[PDB]
Amino acid sequence: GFCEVCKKLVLYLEHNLEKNSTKEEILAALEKGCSFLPDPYQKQCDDFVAEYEPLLLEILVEVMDPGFVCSKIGVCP
Amino acid sequence: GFCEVCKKLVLYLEHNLEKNSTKEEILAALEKGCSFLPDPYQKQCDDFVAEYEPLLLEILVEVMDPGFVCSKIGVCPS
């Protein structure tokens, strides 16, 4: 029943990473996390984000495959 | 290199998913997805979200493990 809408919703969220406002929000959240570290770790954390934010998102989307996610909660085979 | 700050940042993100503001943002994002559907499909989508969104959030929290993420992107050992 819910199998197809679950997969569409996971895909919707993952494609919405292309939206400008979503990109701004993700980068802001990453910068906020780095901001609570002391020097020199804050700067090192900012450098890490600048290099690895794309791969971080790519890996998260990879792991959150719609079929895997939606079968894990039991609405899809 | 970046291994130590990666784990600190992913720990932050893991706990940030548990904030009420973040939980509300994720729920609202899913509900916005449903809003693009015409009737009766929007209601079916809303029903799914109402029943299952906390289980979806749990899966996202589980993925956001510092050791897992930081080794998957290649900055930390396993």
CSV table of C-alpha atoms in Angstrom, one decimal:
chain,number,residue,atom,x,y,z
A,1,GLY,CA,0.0,0.0,0.0
A,2,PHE,CA,2.5,2.6,1.2
A,3,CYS,CA,5.5,1.1,-0.7
A,4,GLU,CA,5.4,3.4,-3.7
A,5,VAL,CA,4.7,6.6,-1.8
A,6,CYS,CA,7.5,5.8,0.7
A,7,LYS,CA,10.0,5.5,-2.2
A,8,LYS,CA,8.8,8.6,-3.9
A,9,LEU,CA,9.1,10.5,-0.6
A,10,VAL,CA,12.7,9.4,0.0
A,11,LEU,CA,13.5,10.4,-3.6
A,12,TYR,CA,11.8,13.7,-3.2
A,13,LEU,CA,13.9,14.6,-0.1
A,14,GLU,CA,17.1,13.5,-1.9
A,15,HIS,CA,16.4,15.5,-5.1
A,16,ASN,CA,15.5,18.5,-3.0
A,17,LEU,CA,19.2,18.7,-2.1
A,18,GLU,CA,19.5,20.4,-5.5
A,19,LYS,CA,17.3,23.3,-4.3
A,20,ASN,CA,19.3,26.5,-3.5
A,21,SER,CA,17.6,27.0,-0.1
A,22,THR,CA,18.4,23.4,0.9
A,23,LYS,CA,22.1,23.8,-0.1
A,24,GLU,CA,22.3,27.0,2.0
A,25,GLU,CA,20.6,25.3,5.0
A,26,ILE,CA,23.0,22.2,4.9
A,27,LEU,CA,26.1,24.4,4.7
A,28,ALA,CA,24.8,26.6,7.6
A,29,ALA,CA,24.2,23.5,9.7
A,30,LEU,CA,27.7,22.2,9.0
A,31,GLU,CA,29.3,25.6,9.8
A,32,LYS,CA,27.2,25.8,13.0
A,33,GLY,CA,28.6,22.4,14.2
A,34,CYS,CA,32.2,23.6,13.5
A,35,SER,CA,31.5,26.8,15.4
A,36,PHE,CA,31.4,25.1,18.8
A,37,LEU,CA,34.9,23.8,18.5
A,38,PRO,CA,37.9,25.7,19.8
A,39,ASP,CA,40.8,26.9,17.7
A,40,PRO,CA,42.5,25.4,15.8
A,41,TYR,CA,39.8,22.8,15.4
A,42,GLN,CA,37.0,25.2,14.2
A,43,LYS,CA,39.2,26.2,11.3
A,44,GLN,CA,40.2,22.6,10.5
A,45,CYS,CA,36.5,21.7,10.7
A,46,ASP,CA,35.6,24.5,8.3
A,47,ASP,CA,38.3,23.3,5.9
A,48,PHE,CA,36.9,19.8,6.1
A,49,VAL,CA,33.4,21.0,5.3
A,50,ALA,CA,34.7,23.0,2.3
A,51,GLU,CA,36.4,19.8,0.9
A,52,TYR,CA,34.0,17.1,1.9
A,53,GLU,CA,30.4,18.5,2.0
A,54,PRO,CA,29.7,17.0,-1.5
A,55,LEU,CA,31.0,13.6,-0.7
A,56,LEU,CA,29.2,13.6,2.7
A,57,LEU,CA,25.9,14.2,0.9
A,58,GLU,CA,26.7,11.7,-1.9
A,59,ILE,CA,27.4,9.0,0.7
A,60,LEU,CA,24.3,9.8,2.7
A,61,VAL,CA,22.1,9.5,-0.4
A,62,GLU,CA,23.9,6.3,-1.3
A,63,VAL,CA,23.1,4.7,2.1
A,64,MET,CA,19.5,6.1,2.1
A,65,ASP,CA,18.5,4.1,-1.0
A,66,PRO,CA,14.7,4.4,-1.3
A,67,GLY,CA,14.1,0.6,-1.6
A,68,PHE,CA,16.4,-0.1,1.3
A,69,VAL,CA,14.9,2.5,3.6
A,70,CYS,CA,11.3,1.6,2.7
A,71,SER,CA,11.8,-2.1,3.1
A,72,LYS,CA,13.6,-1.5,6.4
A,73,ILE,CA,10.5,0.1,7.9
A,74,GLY,CA,8.5,-2.7,6.4
A,75,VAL,CA,6.3,-1.0,3.7
A,76,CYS,CA,8.2,-2.5,0.7
A,77,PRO,CA,9.6,-5.9,-0.1
B,1,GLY,CA,44.3,14.8,8.9
B,2,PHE,CA,40.5,15.5,9.1
B,3,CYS,CA,39.6,12.3,11.0
B,4,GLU,CA,39.2,13.9,14.4
B,5,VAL,CA,37.2,17.0,13.3
B,6,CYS,CA,35.1,14.7,11.1
B,7,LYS,CA,34.0,12.7,14.1
B,8,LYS,CA,33.3,15.8,16.1
B,9,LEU,CA,31.1,17.3,13.3
B,10,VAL,CA,29.2,14.0,12.7
B,11,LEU,CA,28.6,13.8,16.5
B,12,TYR,CA,27.1,17.3,16.3
B,13,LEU,CA,24.9,16.3,13.3
B,14,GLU,CA,23.8,13.1,15.1
B,15,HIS,CA,22.6,15.1,18.1
B,16,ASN,CA,21.2,17.9,16.0
B,17,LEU,CA,18.8,15.5,14.5
B,18,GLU,CA,17.3,15.0,18.0
B,19,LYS,CA,16.5,18.7,18.5
B,20,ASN,CA,12.8,19.5,18.4
B,21,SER,CA,13.4,22.2,15.8
B,22,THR,CA,15.2,19.8,13.5
B,23,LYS,CA,12.5,17.1,14.0
B,24,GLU,CA,9.9,19.6,13.0
B,25,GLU,CA,11.9,20.7,10.0
B,26,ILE,CA,12.2,17.1,8.7
B,27,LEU,CA,8.6,16.4,9.3
B,28,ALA,CA,7.6,19.5,7.5
B,29,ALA,CA,9.8,18.7,4.6
B,30,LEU,CA,8.1,15.3,4.2
B,31,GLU,CA,4.6,16.9,4.5
B,32,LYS,CA,5.6,19.3,1.8
B,33,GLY,CA,6.4,16.4,-0.5
B,34,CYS,CA,2.9,15.0,0.1
B,35,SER,CA,1.4,18.4,-0.7
B,36,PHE,CA,2.3,18.1,-4.4
B,37,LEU,CA,0.0,15.1,-4.9
B,38,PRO,CA,-3.7,15.6,-5.9
B,39,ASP,CA,-6.5,14.0,-3.9
B,40,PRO,CA,-6.9,11.3,-2.8
B,41,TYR,CA,-3.2,10.7,-2.9
B,42,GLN,CA,-2.1,13.6,-0.7
B,43,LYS,CA,-4.1,12.1,2.1
B,44,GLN,CA,-2.6,8.7,1.6
B,45,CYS,CA,0.9,10.2,1.7
B,46,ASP,CA,0.0,12.3,4.8
B,47,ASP,CA,-1.3,9.1,6.5
B,48,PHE,CA,2.0,7.3,5.7
B,49,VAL,CA,4.0,10.2,7.1
B,50,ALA,CA,1.9,10.4,10.3
B,51,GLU,CA,2.4,6.7,11.0
B,52,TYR,CA,6.1,6.1,9.9
B,53,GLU,CA,8.1,9.4,10.0
B,54,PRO,CA,9.6,8.6,13.5
B,55,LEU,CA,10.9,5.3,12.1
B,56,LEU,CA,12.4,7.2,9.1
B,57,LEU,CA,14.0,9.7,11.5
B,58,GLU,CA,15.5,6.8,13.5
B,59,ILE,CA,17.1,5.4,10.3
B,60,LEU,CA,18.7,8.7,9.5
B,61,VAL,CA,20.0,9.0,13.1
B,62,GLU,CA,21.5,5.5,12.8
B,63,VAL,CA,23.3,6.4,9.6
B,64,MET,CA,24.8,9.5,11.2
B,65,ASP,CA,27.3,7.5,13.2
B,66,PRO,CA,30.7,9.3,13.4
B,67,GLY,CA,32.8,6.2,12.9
B,68,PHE,CA,30.7,5.0,10.0
B,69,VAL,CA,30.4,8.3,8.1
B,70,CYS,CA,34.0,9.4,8.5
B,71,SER,CA,35.4,6.0,7.3
B,72,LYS,CA,33.0,5.9,4.4
B,73,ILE,CA,34.3,9.2,3.1
B,74,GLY,CA,37.9,8.0,3.6
B,75,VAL,CA,39.2,10.4,6.3
B,76,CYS,CA,39.2,7.9,9.2
B,77,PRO,CA,40.1,4.2,9.6
B,78,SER,CA,37.5,1.6,10.3
